[PDB]
């Protein structure tokens, strides 16, 4: 016999690819104001007898999520109010160990011929002293940056967004459950979009993410490398209740012709420290399980949890975006115990929390955002779905392993949510031999 070249179009094959993914989804939220809906339901195709390599540490979907959150954040923040006219000397004393101060200042009015002394309430962590007189203060970042106040109409609710492939492309999902982050996945499926992922800003604890199916799964590119992040994904969440129990007034002043600036106004009632209430039994059971799994990656050593010796405050303390407010909670108490191989299993754990209004997510050089004051009282609650941990080096031959909260790199949180996905391109055209010319 003889064979001829035959051409088939619509061949079910693919190659690795990077393409641009777009949004879809199920208040003026910075992430959802100009997007499209998802299909009523995603479809799933099980790719029987298909095995493919995944790598969570080299996933370009993570890099796109990073680029998008920065661009979306900036688009929303840009058309707001410049606070430069307010970079004048503040004069105050405190109103909780001096945490809140009521400061007067000299600011030019919309009338160019007039100046108005005015007042604003600030948190201590946003201002610094001037020329050692114990009364004069400056906004902490004004020396090098432009501080912009976010428009009060913008919501920061982290509404989950699905990432969808363009025509000609597909997203493959890994369904192994206990997948270790790389190498082959032997049970995979084809989808059009990812599940919705919430763009939650966080540092040490992973809040409002997905849970593991069977066990706590601990992933690291190399457990031996003490410089890398260890990502712990829990199969059960831990409940955290956060409150800022201070009945506030929203006050506004103008800082130019249509430029409104919002400050904390008169406080109703007394001043109290913000707190986050974590169930103790749940945290204790969670740590026991984490340790059992960490022990499996090392030579069955005792595990102790400690606090960081340094890093920016945004790194050292656990921070999160609450009801539009920014919390910095003292997590030391959550990582202050030694767990043993022969150890097995009631009240509350309370974290004092500090509040800051001037923040700089993603370290934009020369820029900072000023959070608006929020009146009334704030309550929010979250689910703790994971942890970003690191490992203390220098412990070879010490007989114990020492772990500390790590994190601070937002991409490590996105590596968890995008963990199961890979992007491929469809290559529908190909050839094979046939019997006929």
């Amino acid at each position, epitope marked *: 016999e003889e064979l001829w070249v035959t051409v088939y179009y619509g061949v079910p094959v693919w190659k690795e690819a990077t393409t641009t993914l777009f949004c879809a989804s199920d208040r003026n939220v910075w992430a959802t104001h100009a997007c499209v809906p998802t299909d009523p339901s995603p479809q799933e195709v099980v790719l029987a007898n298909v095995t493919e390599n995944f790598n969570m540490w080299k996933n370009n979907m993570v890099e796109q999520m990073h680029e998008d959150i920065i661009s979306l954040w900036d688009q929303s923040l840009k058309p707001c109010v410049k606070l430069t006219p307010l970079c004048v000397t503040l004069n105050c004393t405190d109103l909780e160990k001096g945490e809140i101060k009521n400061c007067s200042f000299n600011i030019t009015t919309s009338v160019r011929d007039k100046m108005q002394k005015e007042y604003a309430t600030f948190y201590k962590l946003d201002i610094v002293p001037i020329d050692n007189d114990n009364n004069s203060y400056r906004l902490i970042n004004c020396n*090098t940056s432009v501080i912009t106040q976010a428009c009060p109409k913008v919501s920061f609710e982290p509404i989950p967004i699905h990432y969808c492939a363009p025509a000609g492309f597909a997203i493959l999902k890994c369904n192994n459950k206990t997948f270790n982050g790389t190498g082959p996945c032997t049970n995979v499926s084809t989808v059009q979009c990812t599940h919705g992922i919430r763009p939650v800003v966080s540092t040490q604890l992973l809040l409002n993410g997905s849970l593991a199916e069977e066990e706590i799964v601990i992933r690291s590119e190399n457990f031996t490398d003490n410089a890398k992040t260890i990502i712990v994904q829990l199969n059960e969440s831990v409940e955290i209740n956060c409150t800022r129990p201070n009945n506030n007034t929203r006050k506004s002043i103008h800082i130019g012709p249509g430029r409104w600036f919002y400050t904390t106004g008169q406080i109703i009632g007394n001043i109290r420290q913000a707190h986050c209430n974590i169930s103790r039994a749940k945290w204790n059971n969670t740590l026991h399980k984490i340790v059992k799994k960490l022990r499996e990656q090392f030579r069955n050593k005792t595990i102790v949890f400690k606090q*960081s010796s*340094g890093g920016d405050p945004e790194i050292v303390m656990h921070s999160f975006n609450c009801g539009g407010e920014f919390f910095y909670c003292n997590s030391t108490q959550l990582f202050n115990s030694t767990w043993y191989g022969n150890e097995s299993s009631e009240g509350n754990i309370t974290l004092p929390c500090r509040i800051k209004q001037i923040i700089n997510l993603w370290q934009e050089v020369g820029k900072a955002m000023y959070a608006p004051p929020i009146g009334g009282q704030i309550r929010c609650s979250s689910n703790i779905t994971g942890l970003l941990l690191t490992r203390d080096g*220098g412990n070879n031959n010490i007989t114990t392993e020492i772990f500390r909260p790590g994190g601070g*790199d937002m991409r490590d949180n996105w590596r968890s949510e995008l963990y199961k996905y890979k992007v491929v391109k469809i290559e529908p055209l190909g050839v094979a031999p046939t019997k006929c010319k």
Partner: antibody
Amino acid sequence: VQLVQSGSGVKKPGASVRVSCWTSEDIFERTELIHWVRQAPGQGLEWIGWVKTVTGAVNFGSPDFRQRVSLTRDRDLFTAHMDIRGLTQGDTATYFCARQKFYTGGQGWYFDLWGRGTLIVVSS
Amino acid sequence: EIVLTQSPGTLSLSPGETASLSCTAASYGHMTWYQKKPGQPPKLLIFATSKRASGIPDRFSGSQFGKQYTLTITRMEPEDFARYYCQQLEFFGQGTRLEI
């Protein structure tokens, strides 16, 4: 550009010393991890610790450095710092600042650049 | 107890010979090498995966057999009679000297 290294002073026991190193914007912002090492005369090379250029997170090669040495970094001024407290004669050594740009994961730890180095002397 | 063991410590080779320097890796893993001259900072010679470091004109090479990584010096070029060190992530070896 080779890392610019300052210091090389002499201290009495119990004293503190601050050592820093500098690079250009283009090198600093392409570097993920800055490491510090120690080379006491005749002793070989000992790792001290590291500072992550993104978060300021730190680690150490020993619990004793963790207790006495404060490590940090500066984003606007492209520098890094090693603040050593409680100096003793046993700390006399040449110290070096070095960079790892190798965001290569499991490949391992590499030093693309070592700076000139500084000699810290502790004596009575 | 000992993470990285340096061998042989001291070698003596005339120019034109090939050096063979090596270290044993506790718990395996990758291993890299650096070259030092007195009064100078060290420089990277080879990656822990045996890729040559940029700047090296094909004088150094190596590979790993189980736990032992071996680095060699082609024809003992005189410029390379340096002290050499092994590195395995956070640990460094003791160092090897070259004489004539």
